[PDB]
Amino acid sequence: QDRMDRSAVGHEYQSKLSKHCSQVD
Amino acid sequence: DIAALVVDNGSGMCKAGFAGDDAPRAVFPSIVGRPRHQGVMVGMGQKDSYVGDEAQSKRGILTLKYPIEHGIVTNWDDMEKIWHHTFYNELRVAPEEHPVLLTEAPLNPKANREKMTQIMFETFNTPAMYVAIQAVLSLYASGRTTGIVMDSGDGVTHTVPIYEGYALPHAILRLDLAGRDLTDYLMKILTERGYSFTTTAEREIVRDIKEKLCYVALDFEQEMATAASSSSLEKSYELPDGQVITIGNERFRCPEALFQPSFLGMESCGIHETTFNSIMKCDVDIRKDLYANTVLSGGTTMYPGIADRMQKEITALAPSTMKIKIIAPPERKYSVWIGGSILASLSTFQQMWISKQEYDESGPSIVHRKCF
Amino acid sequence: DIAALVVDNGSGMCKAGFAGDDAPRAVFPSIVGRPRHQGVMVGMGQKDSYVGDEAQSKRGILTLKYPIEHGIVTNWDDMEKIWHHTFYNELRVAPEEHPVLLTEAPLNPKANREKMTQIMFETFNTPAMYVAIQAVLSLYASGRTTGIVMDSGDGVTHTVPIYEGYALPHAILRLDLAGRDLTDYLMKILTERGYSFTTTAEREIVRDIKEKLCYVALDFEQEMATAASSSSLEKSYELPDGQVITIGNERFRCPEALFQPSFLGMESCGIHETTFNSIMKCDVDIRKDLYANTVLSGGTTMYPGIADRMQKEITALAPSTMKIKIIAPPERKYSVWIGGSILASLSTFQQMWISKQEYDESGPSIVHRKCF
Amino acid sequence: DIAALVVDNGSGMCKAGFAGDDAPRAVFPSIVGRPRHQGVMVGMGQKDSYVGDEAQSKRGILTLKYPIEHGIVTNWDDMEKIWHHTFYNELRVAPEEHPVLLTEAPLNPKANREKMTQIMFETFNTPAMYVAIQAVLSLYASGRTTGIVMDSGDGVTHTVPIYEGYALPHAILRLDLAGRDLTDYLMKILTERGYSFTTTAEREIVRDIKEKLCYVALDFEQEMATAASSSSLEKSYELPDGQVITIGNERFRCPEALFQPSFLGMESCGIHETTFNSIMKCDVDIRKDLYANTVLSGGTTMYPGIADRMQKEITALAPSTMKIKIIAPPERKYSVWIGGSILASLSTFQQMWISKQEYDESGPSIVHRKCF
Amino acid sequence: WXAXCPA
Amino acid sequence: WXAXCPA
Amino acid sequence: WXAXCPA
């Protein structure tokens, strides 16, 4: 520990799949 | 009741354990030490070669040799010793009763996998085995199915982009530049102060100096002026014999070779450009998800300041409207093993083993069809 | 209790709903997505094919194909999956409980509606069905009974004149130029700026830029001179990667291909001359009312400024004594389905459904007799 | 006396010469080398500049950069040097006394040829100039006037059909898979043997290995089987240092990508399917003659046994009654330039020249008016 | 290129 | 289509 | 390695 950074996000976090306007209608 | 063994065997450090655990059972440097003196106190535990930790505790009188350089096993007699020590002395389990999930770097010669399988089936006589790409297990462990893994082990640094579980093998990049090159570059730049480390038993002292003191500067051209103006950046280290060294500027010039490989006399681009190019090799649609799910792994990425600098680089490189998030957990020193233990425990995996019957039918050439 | 199912089944995009509503229940692109890579994380959503919206969001790792090409169903094994996804997923209603109103483009090959009916009965086991002309429904939905409909969807363009509700088959005009031909011409003309879209995943981005920035011009030469005089027509569009492309002159060069098919290497005349010849093919007495109820419909006619341009062209082609009215409904994207629903809700139409027992008498060829 | 120079300037290799000759006078690999090490001795030659064979010779200490990439000039500060070298150092003639006929692939950024004309008229002060498509030159180099030119350089591949001297722009096809992509794929697949090439210098070694020992198969699967079964299909190459390496299965796997781009992950169609599609986009009354007069050209179609493979493919795709003949002249490596010199010796092309004052009166855009 | 592909 | 045009 | 780099 102490090797985590200010701009580091734990693997526990999860984003959502990409959705661009080219994908709706 | 049989449980698979997850045995990493990457360059620099070998980590073995049972399938279904949260941490490797046994971690030890993957070295083999040959005694370079002729000792006559016979009967006191003399041997012909010391493997793993037993070599480090004796490295003073040994020549330490790594059987795996840049991800490739250059010596198979030594690798058989490493695996035997892993099976019978660290895990203390017969290999002929459990399946073995080994890992390999991408873009290695096919002879590596061929001989891995031949050894695991003809010498240790395992009932089943598998060979997995490390940067895929590093995503398994992160609890994801979409992201670009940036795995930087001791001897090799590779990037693999995956989206929704479908890997893009036309964008897998590899860079033979890792801890072992940073440690050999620190051994060179340390001479500017007057410190001369040359023995293979002092490469370990230099690797310890590097993994205890060195950090990655957020701005190299500014931290150079900082370390030039004042002595508020020096740190002292105590060798195992009493002498004390002090290193102020080398601290961030050691890992700076990752981002400017020209320091080592290499044409290749840094790790940030290696990741950016591997992102821009994919399709226009999935680049946004690859940007915001940039995973890190391997020991070489355990530098204080690596995530900040990587983000500052890949943000000045990516379009101004893309959000970059460097997924770097503190448990990334062993993400590949956790991914292996996750994969080996799954039920849908129990059909993906290479069974001993299969190997008896087609020889070692089978590992190319089954293993991705 | 039961209500008929109205499925537009148009080329490129599919619409569906229940008979007797003022809006289609579900609209989804007619795209069949198949993975072109080999997954490495098995058990995390592996499906042999993705259809509809799931084939739009995941287009980064899919090859996408259209079951209908120029109004003709080219892959029936894919049309079956599209129909199955329409029935069992978007509407979540069984086919054996409702009549189904398919729609077809005029002058389409003989086996098209035959196989449509065959699949409707032998696979889905629908009670009743019909195959209506895609164009005539638009005049129904428009709230009129005389006039010529200009239906330009994604795969086929056609001008059909109808008087008092009876269609004039002798004056039907068809043109293979469509919205997907404009997408392809944009994929060509965009290269002059320095952009390259060639992948089926990127054809979708090209289609999105088209229906967002391109617009028909009223005087093509004057707008060309405007663009060449001062750059005030350029617009910035952001791809899913975050690049900022900039199309200027290329705004109206794409829709202009409707009026001059010579840009696409085609010999036929534009849509305005097509409508003019179709009208002048109609009986002289009724022409007086035709020129007053020229209605645009379908997707591709939703271009900014297409109304004024069509009016100018057709009034410069037709004599000055005639009254030219280009009536453009502000919801013409679904007019075909609205008219299909209106027609299906009629008690008089409750006898025009080709029934199953009737299908058993003369085989699929029965569709050629009942449908006009 | 006074003649017209001809500077092909294709990707990879720049060709140049005088009109009338049957071979380009000066041909050299169009690269620019830059020293990546700091010189220390006095007496050493030029810095920041190494062009052509001079750069090829000393590539052991340089980083190499191709100013052209996929047919688009990426860095003009280097292309200007390339032109300066081919004018003053290879042809050894002042460029202010000769017209110059440059070449450009179809479907390229307009600003490319705009800057080409601007540099030709603003730096070297040529009296006149002209830019032509390479395909039109290739067909004009075969003496034919009715054929489909299949050209394939190092960065572009294009099929262009021409009938009775009239060019059909609607059917011009350009695939981006070309020679350098094959070189990269070879660099990637050679790692299976264990041969690592990652430097831009060793890329030249790989390219030479490719064009010396690689051959495209007639039946890919059969060749794969024979290679996997026996060793009678393994060749040996000698690296510059003196080592000897062996290439077997890779020999035909490398060029096979031209027919199956999926090997590179590029989800597109092969070059034979590209030819078939560019033919099927032409009028139905001329497809047979195009089927009869397919001509090849460029340094990427000299692989042994490529004509027969393309003929087999097209015959499999084309109708049975249509006869297929692959005209493969054994001088195609320079054919386009030959075409260039030819187009420069016609009294009919001595008026199509873009005059200096013609450039002054209208600016660089005149290239689009005069040149097609 | 500027958009699509590198060049 | 089968003849003339693709579909 | 065998050619290029050591390993």
Ligand SMILES: Nc1ncnc2c1ncn2[C@@H]1O[C@H](COP(=O)(O)OP(=O)(O)O)[C@@H](O)[C@H]1O
């Ligand atoms: N905390 C750290 N800080 C800096 N460098 C490190 C750190 N941990 C490991 N390294 C470097 O990375 C290597 C260890 O990485 P490791 O994950 O053990 O490789 P592998 O998984 O291939 O065995 C060592 O060679 C060391 O130089």
Ligand SMILES: Nc1ncnc2c1ncn2[C@@H]1O[C@H](COP(=O)(O)OP(=O)(O)O)[C@@H](O)[C@H]1O
């Ligand atoms: N404003 C617009 N500009 C250009 N094209 C459009 C516009 N609106 C719709 N389209 C195009 O028209 C087609 C949609 O027509 P539609 O009525 O759905 O017929 P289909 O069901 O055969 O696609 C698509 O190609 C779509 O991109």
Ligand SMILES: Nc1ncnc2c1ncn2[C@@H]1O[C@H](COP(=O)(O)OP(=O)(O)O)[C@@H](O)[C@H]1O
């Ligand atoms: N006989 C050959 N077989 C295979 N490849 C070749 C042969 N000769 C040249 N090449 C390849 O063609 C590429 C470029 O040559 P060429 O296509 O003639 O350049 P240009 O595109 O300017 O015509 C080089 O990478 C070279 O290796």
Ligand SMILES: [Mg+2]
């Ligand atoms: Mg590792």
Ligand SMILES: [Mg+2]
């Ligand atoms: Mg429609």
Ligand SMILES: [Mg+2]
């Ligand atoms: Mg060329």
